[PDB]
Structure formats: C-alpha cells, structure tokens
C-alpha cells in the first residue's frame, strides 16, 4: 500500500482543474481506512501512477532461499524417529474413525451450519483422516528413498 502525492491546493480539486494538470496519468483509488482518507486523498493530488523499473537479474536475487538444500534433500533421520512418526499418526487416526462411520451412513444435509451439529461436520473426520494419510505417506517415502540412495552412492 503506497501512494504518491505532489500535493496541490484544495481549489484545484473543487474547480476540476486538477485532472487537466495530471494528464499523462492513469490514476487509481484504494481505501485502507474509510471515507475520511478518501476525502484527504482528493484534496491532495490523489494516486498518481507508480511504475516499477525491475528486470530478471534483480528478480533472480529475490527468488533465493538455501543452497543448504544440497545437504537437506539427502538427509534422513534415525530409524527410531521414523517409527515415532508412524506410531503417532496411526494412534491419532483411531480417534477420528468412530465419527467417520456416521459420516458415511448419512450427510444428506448440504447446509453447512446444520451438518456441523448433525454428523460432527465441523471437526470433520474425512478432512482430517485424509490429511493424515497424506502426511504419513509422503514423510515415509522421502525418508526411505534417501536412506537407500545414499547407501549405493557413498560406497
């Protein structure tokens, strides 16, 4: 949220002179904070156009994160840890499962507020159980995949 003002007097707005002076402008209007701001803006010179001088070299600098990605893509943790993750998720999945039975049996309702009370639609077992299978699958794949890759290559 940036705006530009040269700032010229009130009369210039009132007459309608101020758009004759601006020519070679597009202009724009936004409202961070209500009618009071709009009025202040109009008195000034309103939003005069901001363009950006940018290109791909500058754009590439901003892109970056970590070259450290080099070590990290290969890294995998201790096997006891692999087991902790798998255990925590299966245990979790048991809790939500009991609601899930109801969900599939019913859910004729399509009205979000009524569904929420009826078949525990809000705190849904479908959303969360799916979300859970998906973390567990991806997590196991990257850890497992790395361990094997490293083995062959280092020796």
């Amino acid at each position: 949220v940036i705006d530009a003002f040269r700032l010229i007097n009130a009369n210039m707005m009132v007459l309608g002179h101020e758009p004759r002076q601006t020519t070679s402008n597009l202009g724009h209007l936004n409202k961070p904070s209500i009618q009071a701001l709009i009025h202040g803006l109009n008195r000034h010179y309103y939003s005069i156009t901001i363009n950006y001088r940018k290109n791909e070299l500058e754009q590439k600098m901003l892109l970056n994160l970590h070259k450290k990605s080099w070590m990290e893509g290969l890294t995998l943790q201790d096997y006891s840890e692999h087991c902790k993750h798998n255990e925590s998720v299966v245990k979790e999945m048991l809790e939500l499962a009991k609601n899930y039975n109801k969900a599939v049996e019913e859910e004729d309702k399509m009205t979000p507020e009524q569904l929420a009370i009826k078949n525990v639609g809000k705190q849904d077992p479908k959303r969360h159980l799916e979300e859970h299978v998906d973390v567990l699958m991806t997590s196991n794949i990257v850890q497992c995949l790395a361990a094997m890759l490293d083995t062959v290559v280092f020796k």
Partner: protein, 152 residues
C-alpha cells in the same frame, strides 16, 4: 593408583592387590603410615570393597568397548569361575551397574542387545548423516587453500 583405573585397559585383581599393598600401607600422609580407607588395619575393612569394584569396572569397560567376547576370557580377568560369575551377573544387571548377558556354554557375552532388526536399522541412518555434514565443511576450507593470494 589413579592412573591405572582412569586408563581403560583390561586388568585383574591378582596383580592389583600385591602392588598397591606395598604402596598404600606404607604411605606417609602428614607423616605416618596410617591413612585408612584401604591402606592400614582399619583400612582393610574398606579394602574388601576394592576387589568387587575391580570386577564391576573390568566387565563395564569390556562391555562398552567390545560387542562380543567369550565368557572364558572374561573369567581369567575377573578372577572368578563361571558358576561364581553367573551369580554375580544376576544382581549387577538389576542395580544397572552394567548391561551384559552371559550364557552357561561360555561361548559368548553379548554386550549389545541381541541381533534384532532395530539396532542394524538405527546404525544405517547415523552412518549416512555424518558423511554429508563432513563433505560440506572440508569444501570450505579447501577453497581458501587453493586460490589463496593467487601467488601460486
């Protein structure tokens, strides 16, 4: 006396008693022979304990350093017989002075947990991770060494 125990090397009671017997008992404190707590006459009551301590320490160092040794080799150092060692082993493990499992065959002492798939699994991950940390670090030092002032 300090130097022998601090250095982890395999030893035995038979040698340890005789030598220290002449040093400790003789040793001038402020000035007299007396110092007690395993030196002189009173000291003998404490001394008895020292034997037990050598045998807990021998089994401990061997446990940590090695993963398998035979029961016959172990007995020679401890100055026990197999029947005597076996009794002692039952009480040691319960207190948790050491972790060791001994058999009646005197084929082996497993100072590791028995060959179950989880230990093998655990090690395989750790070996991989250490290499990757090390290869990064060396490249950083190497880069300065190469280029340098660019006089070479």
């Amino acid at each position: 006396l300090l130097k022998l125990f601090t250095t982890m090397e395999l030893m035995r009671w038979s040698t340890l008693v005789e030598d220290y017997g002449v040093e400790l008992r003789k040793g001038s404190s402020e000035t007299p022979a007396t110092d007690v707590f395993s030196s002189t006459e009173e000291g003998e009551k404490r001394w008895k304990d020292l034997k037990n301590r050598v045998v807990e320490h021998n089994i401990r160092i061997m446990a940590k350093y090695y993963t398998r040794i035979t029961m016959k080799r172990m007995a020679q150092l401890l100055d026990l017989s197999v029947d005597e060692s076996e009794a002692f082993l039952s009480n040691l493990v319960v207190n948790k002075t050491i972790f060791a499992k001994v058999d009646r065959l005197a084929g082996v002492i497993n100072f590791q947990r028995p060959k179950d798939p989880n230990n093998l699994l655990n090690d395989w991950s750790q070996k991989l991770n250490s290499l990757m940390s090390l290869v990064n670090k060396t490249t950083h030092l190497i880069a300065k060494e190469e280029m340098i002032h660019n006089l070479q």
